[PDB]
């Protein structure tokens, strides 16, 4: 009311919304015309549209393999390897692509496993993912809604809003230095 209306930062990309100086910041974060960053877990700093995400991964990250199936096994090899490492692969099911990431971070080591949907924030609400570590007379399960690549996983990992475990847990489910994470994607 009576306040001057400013166009969105991504008005050049197709945003037809004009908001005042205060409300401007809150929308630009949740804006659909905001460029998508590279979903790969700091080496790559690429940005572009959502339609350019799958070709970018096919060309600049050829080493990432894609498995067909809603229920697969993510066998991350050399989990005891010295230093902080990352494991990434893709899951093709329900006509969509999902990024499966296992992040090893230096602890005062800790592990973070999460699933992202290559799609919008609204598209991610229609899915659910399950992560499970299985052993003899042991099972650790994590279930949640997959994050959209638009918002990423940086905030989610920092809030531990994913499957979180340490070196002690990892050795209980590790077979010949490899950890097998059962990944199940479902439509809700």
């Amino acid at each position: 009311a009576n306040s001057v209306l400013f166009p969105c930062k991504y008005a050049s990309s197709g945003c037809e919304i004009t908001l005042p100086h205060t409300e401007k910041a809150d929308h630009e974060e949740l804006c659909e015309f905001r460029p998508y960053s590279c979903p790969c877990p700091a080496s790559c700093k690429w940005q572009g549209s959502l339609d350019a995400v799958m070709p970018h991964l096919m060309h600049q990250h050829k080493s990432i393999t894609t498995l067909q199936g809603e229920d697969i096994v993510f066998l991350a090899t050399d989990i005891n390897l010295p230093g902080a490492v990352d494991w990434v692969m893709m899951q093709s099911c329900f006509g969509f692509h999902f990024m499966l990431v296992l992040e090893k971070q230096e602890k005062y080591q800790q592990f973070f496993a999460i699933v992202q949907l290559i799609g919008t924030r609204k598209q991610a609400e229609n899915f659910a993912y399950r992560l499970e570590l299985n052993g003899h007379r042991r099972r650790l399960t994590w279930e949640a809604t997959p994050r959209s690549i638009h918002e990423g996983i940086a905030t989610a990992i920092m809030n531990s809003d994913c499957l979180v475990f340490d070196t002690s847990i990892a050795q209980l489910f590790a077979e010949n230095g490899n950890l097998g994470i059962n990944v199940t994607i479902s439509m809700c």
């Binding site: 790969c40 080493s63 229920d71 697969i72 096994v73 993510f74 050399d78 692969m89 097998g180 059962n182």
Partner: peptide
């Protein structure tokens, strides 16, 4: 008989 992928650590 779920498909398994041996994922090596990222280079």
């Amino acid at each position: 008989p779920k498909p398994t992928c041996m994922v090596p650590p990222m280079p």
